[PDB]
Design a protein around this ligand. Structure first.
Ligand code: HEM
Ligand SMILES: CC(C)NC[C@H](O)COc1cccc2ccccc12
Ligand SMILES: CC(C)NC[C@H](O)COc1cccc2ccccc12
Ligand SMILES: CC(C)NC[C@H](O)COc1cccc2ccccc12
Ligand SMILES: CC(C)NC[C@H](O)COc1cccc2ccccc12
Ligand SMILES: *[C@@H]1O[C@H](CO)[C@@H](O)[C@H](O)[C@H]1NC(C)=O
Ligand SMILES: *[C@@H]1O[C@H](CO)[C@@H](O)[C@H](O)[C@H]1NC(C)=O
Ligand SMILES: *[C@@H]1O[C@H](CO)[C@@H](O)[C@H](O)[C@H]1NC(C)=O
Ligand SMILES: *[C@@H]1O[C@H](CO)[C@@H](O)[C@H](O)[C@H]1NC(C)=O
Ligand SMILES: *[C@@H]1O[C@H](CO)[C@@H](O)[C@H](O)[C@H]1NC(C)=O
Ligand SMILES: [Cl-]
Ligand SMILES: [Mg+2]
Length: 325
């Protein structure tokens, strides 16, 4: 389907409403590394089994949380291209599942959002690095560290100052312990943006003060559950305030090189000075390497989804065409 447009009415409103109650997981229901999508599934803004189309995802993030359209489009089509089934138009928000349909050939994985190194990556706030065995479940120890950082830098609330400190702490901990730590290109970007989302989108929209309380934080991060009477944000947004997070502890993109404490800067990575390069590498390298020589129907699906992806790219970038036009 065509990507949905922006909300006709983007006011704050009750989103934990009669039509969208929280329900617990049934056997087979899939949740993954994204507390936003998890919460939308657990309130029925998405299918409750956690398998959805790109259009369903875009509508859900807008309706349920007031995620802005451009961000919704870029994130959703990026995820779908690398983790979803392009023929069936289905993406798992978590683990790989037969519910997304017949798989394409190797080397494409169609691994859902749980697939490490495509969208999901290291130094997540409340999820462990894939190297440590589980990149998707809520981790209590990591959440308690988020609480501790909120106590120390946020007066007990999570805000952009807390985000700046916690983002850096998680990077440093991965450098110290994960010999395979990777922090380049798309993950370098998303790792920063995601730390703003709890302050911008999990804060009740009647307040919109950037100060997330720990009861609400746990509700979203652990239980995929909106607080009782939760109002979404009062305008469309995504990653505003990311500048505060970066400014706290500016980092270069890089990786450990097969040992702990060996963080080595990658001069071929994009960074915040080269946003168009991030897009170009995502398409030319990441997507292309999953689908190096697609058959006719896959090529058509790839090109359609790549056109949609480009709608979410910041103005000023040039579209690239890995499979021609
Ligand atoms: C628009 C479609 C979206 C997709 C496909 C998506 C997918 C993902 C994925 C795969 C991750 C894993 C990144 C990591 O390794 O840490 C992630 C991180 C995250 N996403 Fe989303 N996301 C979307 C939008 C949203 C929205 C709307 C919210 C909030 C309303 C949100 C909140 C988060 C948070 C908080 C994290 C980091 C969680 C943590 O580090 O513990 N995302 N997202
Ligand atoms: C169904 C689900 C939302 N139940 C919520 C729990 O009964 C209450 O949750 C909680 C409430 C208060 C503190 C906590 C600390 C750790 C883990 C959970 C906590
Ligand atoms: C509302 C609009 C200005 N948002 C786009 C800006 O680049 C801010 O958002 C973002 C900034 C930086 C990284 C991110 C990663 C994923 C999603 C959004 C991100
Ligand atoms: C630090 C701040 C000023 N910059 C934020 C970044 O420029 C956000 O960039 C981006 C964030 C998310 C997706 C994208 C897709 C294409 C191009 C740029 C994207
Ligand atoms: C790897 C890359 C060069 N190939 C992508 C495209 O297959 C390039 O060739 C093609 C270009 C245009 C239309 C086509 C239709 C079916 C199969 C191939 C087509
Ligand atoms: C937009 O929605 C809000 C909240 O539901 C409502 O109060 C407002 O009147 C709506 N505006 C229009 C133009 O319908
Ligand atoms: C290790 O890093 C490589 C390349 O950076 C990646 O392909 C692989 O999935 C990573 N594995 C884990 C468990 O981190
Ligand atoms: C949670 O994260 C901690 C700290 O990184 C780690 O030691 C632990 O194994 C993780 N998993 C669980 C299930 O607690
Ligand atoms: C975070 O909270 C602390 C304590 O209230 C405050 O000093 C800091 O200015 C806050 N930061 C933001 C970005 O709101
Ligand atoms: C991506 O490929 C296009 C050709 O399709 C090329 O013009 C562009 O320079 C490439 N960009 C990168 C970063 O490789
Ligand atoms: Cl919007
Ligand atoms: Mg992760």
């Amino acid at each position: 389907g065509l990507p949905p447009g922006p909300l006709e009415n983007s006011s704050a409103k009750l989103v934990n409403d009669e039509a969208h109650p929280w329900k617990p997981l049934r056997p087979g229901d899939i949740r993954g590394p994204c507390p936003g999508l998890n919460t939308l599934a657990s309130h029925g803004y998405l299918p409750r089994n956690g398998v959805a189309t790109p259009a369903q995802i875009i509508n859900a993030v807008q309706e349920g949380f007031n995620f802005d359209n451009q961000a919704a489009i870029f994130a959703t089509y990026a995820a779908h291209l690398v983790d979803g089934n392009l023929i069936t138009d289905l993406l798992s928000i978590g683990r790989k599942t037969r519910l997304t349909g017949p798989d394409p050939p190797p080397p494409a994985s169609v691994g859902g959002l749980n697939e490490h190194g495509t969208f999901e990556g290291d130094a997540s706030m409340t999820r462990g690095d894939a190297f440590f065995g589980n990149n998707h479940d809520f981790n209590e120890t990591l959440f308690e560290q988020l609480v501790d950082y909120s106590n120390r830098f946020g007066g007990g609330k999570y805000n952009l100052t807390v985000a700046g400190e916690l983002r850096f702490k998680r990077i440093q901990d991965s450098i110290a312990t994960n010999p395979n730590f990777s922090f380049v290109d798309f993950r370098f970007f998303t790792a920063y943006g995601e730390t703003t989302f709890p302050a911008n989108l999990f804060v009740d929209g009647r307040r919109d003060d950037g100060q997330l309380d720990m009861d609400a934080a746990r509700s979203f991060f652990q239980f995929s559950r909106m607080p009782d009477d939760f109002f979404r944000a009062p305008s469309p947004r995504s990653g505003t305030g990311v500048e505060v997070v970066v400014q706290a502890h500016p980092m270069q993109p890089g990786r450990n090189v097969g040992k702990i404490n060996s963080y080595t800067v990658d001069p071929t990575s994009s960074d915040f000075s080269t946003p168009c390069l991030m897009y170009e590498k995502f398409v030319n390298i990441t997507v292309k390497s999953l689908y190096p020589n697609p058959t006719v129907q896959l090529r058509k699906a790839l090109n359609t989804n790549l056109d949609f992806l480009f709608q979410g790219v910041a103005a000023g970038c040039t579209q690239v065409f890995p499979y021609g036009r």
